[PDB]
Amino acid sequence: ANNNPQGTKPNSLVCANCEGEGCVACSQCKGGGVNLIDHFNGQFKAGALCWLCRGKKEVLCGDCNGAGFIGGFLSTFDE
Amino acid sequence: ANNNPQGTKPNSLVCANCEGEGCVACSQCKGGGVNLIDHFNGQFKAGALCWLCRGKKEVLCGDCNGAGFIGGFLSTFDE
Amino acid sequence: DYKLTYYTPDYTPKDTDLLAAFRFSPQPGVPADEAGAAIAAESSTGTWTTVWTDLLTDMDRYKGKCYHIEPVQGEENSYFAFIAYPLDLFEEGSVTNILTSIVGNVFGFKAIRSLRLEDIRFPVALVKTFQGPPHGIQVERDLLNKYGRPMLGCTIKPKLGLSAKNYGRAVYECLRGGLDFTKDDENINSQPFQRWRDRFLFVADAIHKSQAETGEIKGHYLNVTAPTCEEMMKRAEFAKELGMPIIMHDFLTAGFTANTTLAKWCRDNGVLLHIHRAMHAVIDRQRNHGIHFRVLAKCLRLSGGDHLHSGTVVGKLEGDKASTLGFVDLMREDHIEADRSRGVFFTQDWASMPGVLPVASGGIHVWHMPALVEIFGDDSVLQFGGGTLGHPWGNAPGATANRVALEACVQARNEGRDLYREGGDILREAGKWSPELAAALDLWKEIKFEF
Amino acid sequence: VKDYKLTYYTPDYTPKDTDLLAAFRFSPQPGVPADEAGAAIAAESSTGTWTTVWTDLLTDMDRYKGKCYHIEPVQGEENSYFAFIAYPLDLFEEGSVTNILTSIVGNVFGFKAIRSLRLEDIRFPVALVKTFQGPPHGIQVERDLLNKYGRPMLGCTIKPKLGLSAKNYGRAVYECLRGGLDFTKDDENINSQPFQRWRDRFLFVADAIHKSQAETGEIKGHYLNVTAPTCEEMMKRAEFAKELGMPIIMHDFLTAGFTANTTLAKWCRDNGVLLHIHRAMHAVIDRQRNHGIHFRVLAKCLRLSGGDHLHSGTVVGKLEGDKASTLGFVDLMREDHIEADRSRGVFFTQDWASMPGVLPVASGGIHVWHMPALVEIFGDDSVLQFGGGTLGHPWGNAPGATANRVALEACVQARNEGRDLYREGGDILREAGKWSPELAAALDLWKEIKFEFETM
Amino acid sequence: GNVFGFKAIRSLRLEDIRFPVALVKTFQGPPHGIQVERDLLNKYGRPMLGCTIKPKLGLSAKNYGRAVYECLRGGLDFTKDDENINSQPFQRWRDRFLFVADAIHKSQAETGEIKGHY
């Protein structure tokens, strides 16, 4: 996925990564919904649900934590 | 003597009127201690102690109330 | 996020919404609309999205909505922002909850240089759940039986290093002369050189003597600010047992919980409460960061209090004088229309809640008597510092000087004369039948100017 | 005092060990000198006169007044000075913070001949430290009670949820506590509000605590918010919370005041619960670097009044200029003797006379990739609050708690074994995220830091 | 504590002791002091003087009160209860307190000063 550590739009406050959505697409199944490769040893085998998103094709975003912007008690450190 | 503003010294917080003494000389008995004219008909006239300063030769400065400077609390909270 | 969902510029606010007006200055690079939406989101659920709120379709019932971001003229890189909060976010009877919910963590936002809270509007639905002033204005003017003129008070300046015996004697001298109230210094509680029970005893003795001697009703504000709540209640109960009619408190160092507790006690036990405003310049002195004082005056009128310090307006330039007149009107009156020229941002209706009494202080003397008498009117108290204790003759002569000057000015205002132009003339024709007023007019040489 | 040196600016004066010292940073109006402004600040904080007209009326005086004994310019800024002032001990009541505040910062901040004034530090003598109570329990007693040695403590706040019933609140608390956390925390602005009254919340939270603690075998807790309109309500809430058997409560020491905080601290000392202090409405007082009251003064006043935990803010994302100040005032509230050092903001040497310490709480948007740094900066005498880094795990709350627990234990074990934690955090967390799916999912959801050359 | 029982010394005596200010400031001290006590009394300039009642035992409550009244009317300031008279069978305490209060009020309203009995 993107490699912005924690970045906004050029002038706006909207976080660039999620574009203000607050949610991104799963990076394991690529929005597919089912697992593709066996991952650990065989307890997560291909054909079943995705091991990460549990079958929702949509996860939260790290830089902007569910807040459509950068700053505040969710995305930044409290002083 | 009757200069309108409270009048701090030039570039100095100290009040000019008393020059930091906090006290001035009586402008009625001329620092003498006894009356010079009759003021209230039949009550305060020459011979006895000054009617204003009661014979102490010194009164409080009008500009500052003993503060010794103009911007304090006893003086300047008249905004 | 081209849609902001928090900046609804066409939203009109209800009559059960709490409105707030901020003045903010955004960082370089950030626009104004998004800064307003961010101020609306920080002081509520701190999200623009709906990834948590959409738990079971329980959305947007507990979020604020910016609806006006007009800019302020004169200054640039500085704007006004209006915000509307629902009513079911706040609890009843608690001012701490309102403060915590609004100004809790918005001031620590990172994408703004500075942020100030200028006004606030409480709906009637929320005004009716607080107690308010214990007594008010009409009741506290009927209890003391003083009609048709301001009240007179004196502060005792030789604060520290005075035995309780001498303290009582000074109080007796001042009250016997003709004043109404004496005030206890702000930082005199229980120091080792003068404990509080002794002070209370001798002050009560002096009050009883002077009141039985002069026929009027006298009083002394007794400072009950304590380290805990048990000590505060002990002091208040003892001051009531002696028969004292009024006490004192500090609502910004002791807090709002202690002030609400004391206000409820004072309502139940028939005592009047005077509120001193120490430690207030720490919050609101700079015009670019803090909490304007009219917001704290409103919060005080809500929680409790009968008198309130407000500061003189005799020497302010303009705007500041207009601002102080505005937030005096916000305290004494019952319905205030929006007039931005004198601070008031929103229309406030108090639903027949009693008023609060302004107090002027800070080094005023007899020559200021006309101006004050026509600015604050007759619903106010006038505190004198050195203007009473500095008379060349003593304390009782200074008391009588101030009393004579005040009654002369008010009698001259009643007849229809003008106090701006010929106030000094009134004082001069009054300072002929009395030596004390003549000595006072000769000591304070300040006849500065009028009109 | 026109050309006389004012009897308030005595640079040849050295203070006693029973004097309260204060350091102001001020900037005077155009035209006014520096020494006169210092002497005027000294005269405002006490008897407001330079002369002897009022005071010396019949006997001795000049023993209830402050003395500015040092003035020096600030380096890097022009028209900005430091003034040091020394007050006697007879001016202050025994056991009251309200009195110290209203006697020092009472009405000096409104002086007209000053553009701006800030209170940078303060020094209480031991003779005054001994008349206060201090923290109810402290650090060691608290550690013994919770029975948690070695590691920092873990917590989670249910922050971005406002409108939940009481039962779902208890359910979320249970899922977090069962997963492996130690403390759960209320939202800071939750009280008895129409959608969620306080007694219901207390009941269901207590039930969740009992269930989880019984089925996991260790002591767990939830900071219940007992902030109230009056003191009767506050005492009712605290008594009912003790009845249920709760170990810890919460309070806001700036909107409720110092009288209520002192009363609550004495109650907590008598009844044996721990007190967690939440700093709210503080940026109103100390954000601008030119006016207000810096936060180390309030941290000292809280250590005096009462409190076991205190919010202090993280340092993972600050400049060294301010990271130094934060580390300074974190040492000012854990140790017992702090030597003067201006690089870390400490102005005076403070000795605490065996008074216990408080516990720093580091909160606000932190996730697993910060766990190395936080473990080596704050040490292991602290609490770590995870707001969003826990409730946002891709498949629940208990897995998020388990992920955070695993990461913390991995980091502290690695620190014990001698390895570094600045050049070796990433590979530590990646090696630990091998035999646990929860930590792997947590590492993939958020993203690494990559601070700088090799360290901070 | 047990230092006085130490068997390797013949005799031991504690002569003085110095309390630091840090420790002095945690005690209450005298309830009133000297200034306060003088102020309530309003007795300035002279040492106060008082009496003790040595015809101690056997006296009823009323004769005790009468002796106190006669002594206080003469011009003394303080009168004193006998050190070992608390609630003996011949004279209980409530009756003694009653009659002593009566005598104090009489003599104080008669002369015009502030009288007292320990």
UniProtKB/Swiss-Prot annotation, chains A, B:
UniProt keyword DNA-binding, yes or no: no
Zn finger limits (CR-type): 5-76
Keywords: Chaperone, Chloroplast, Metal-binding, Plastid, Repeat, Transit peptide, Zinc, Zinc-finger
Name of protein: Protein BUNDLE SHEATH DEFECTIVE 2, chloroplastic
Family: Belongs to the BSD2 chaperone family.
Parent sequence residues shown: 58 to 136 of 136
Gene expressing this chain: BSD2
Domain of life: Eukaryota
Function: Chloroplast chaperone required for RuBisCo biogenesis and translational regulation of the RuBisCo large subunit (RbcL). Stabilizes an end-state assembly intermediate of eight RbcL subunits until the small subunits (RBCSs) become available to produce a complete stable RuBisCo complex containing eight small and eight large subunits.
Subcellular location per the Swiss-Prot or TrEMBL entry: Plastid, Chloroplast stroma
Organism of origin: Arabidopsis thaliana
Curated annotation (Swiss-Prot), chain C:
Site (Transition state stabilizer): 316
Post-translational modifications reported in the UniProt record: The disulfide bond which can form in the large chain dimeric partners within the hexadecamer appears to be associated with oxidative stress and protein turnover.
BP terms from Gene Ontology: photorespiration; reductive pentose-phosphate cycle
Effect of residue 197 to S: Forms stable homodimer in presence of RbcX2 but does not form RbcL8 form
Sequence positions that bind Mg(2+): 183, 185-186
Enzyme Commission number(s) of this protein: 4.1.1.39
Effect of residue 111 to Y: Reduced formation of the RbcL8-(RbcX2)8 complex
Phenotype when changing residue 91 to Q: Protein aggregates, forms RbcL2-RbcX(2)2 homodimer intermediate poorly
Motif (Interacts with RbcX2): 446-451
Pfam family, one: RuBisCO_large
UniProtKB keywords: Bacterial microcompartment, Calvin cycle, Carbon dioxide fixation, Carboxysome, Disulfide bond, Lyase, Magnesium, Metal-binding, Monooxygenase, Oxidoreductase, Photorespiration, Photosynthesis
Cofactor: Mg(2+)
Keyword Oxidoreductase among UniProt keywords: yes
Enzyme class of the recorded protein, top EC level: lyase
Residues annotated for substrate binding in this entry: 105, 155, 159, 277, 309, 361
Active site residues per record: 157, 276
Subcellular location field: Carboxysome
Keyword Lyase: yes
Additional free-text comment from the UniProt record: RuBisCO folding and assembly commences when the nascent large subunit folds with the help of the chaperonin GroEL-GroES. Monomers require chaperone RbcX2 to assemble into RbcL8 octamers yielding RbcL8-(RbcX2)8. RbcX2 is displaced by RbcS; as RbcX2 is removed RbcS mediates the ordering of an internal RbcL loop (Thr-64-Leu-70) in a catalytically active conformation.
Binding partners and assembly: Heterohexadecamer of 8 large chains and 8 small chains; disulfide-linked. The disulfide link is formed within the large subunit homodimers. The exposed C-terminus binds in a cleft in the RbcX2 (shown with endogenous and Anabaena strain CA protein). RbcX2 is displaced by RbcS; as RbcX2 is removed RbcS mediates the ordering of an internal RbcL loop (Thr-64-Leu-70) in a catalytically active conformation.
Similarity field: Belongs to the RuBisCO large chain family. Type I subfamily.
The protein's role, per its UniProt record: RuBisCO catalyzes two reactions: the carboxylation of D-ribulose 1,5-bisphosphate, the primary event in carbon dioxide fixation, as well as the oxidative fragmentation of the pentose substrate in the photorespiration process. Both reactions occur simultaneously and in competition at the same active site.
Domain notes: Binding of RbcS probably induces a conformation change that displaces RbcX2 and triggers the final mature conformation.
HAMAP family registered for this protein in UniProt: RuBisCO_L_type1
Designated name of the protein: Ribulose bisphosphate carboxylase large chain
Originating gene: cbbL
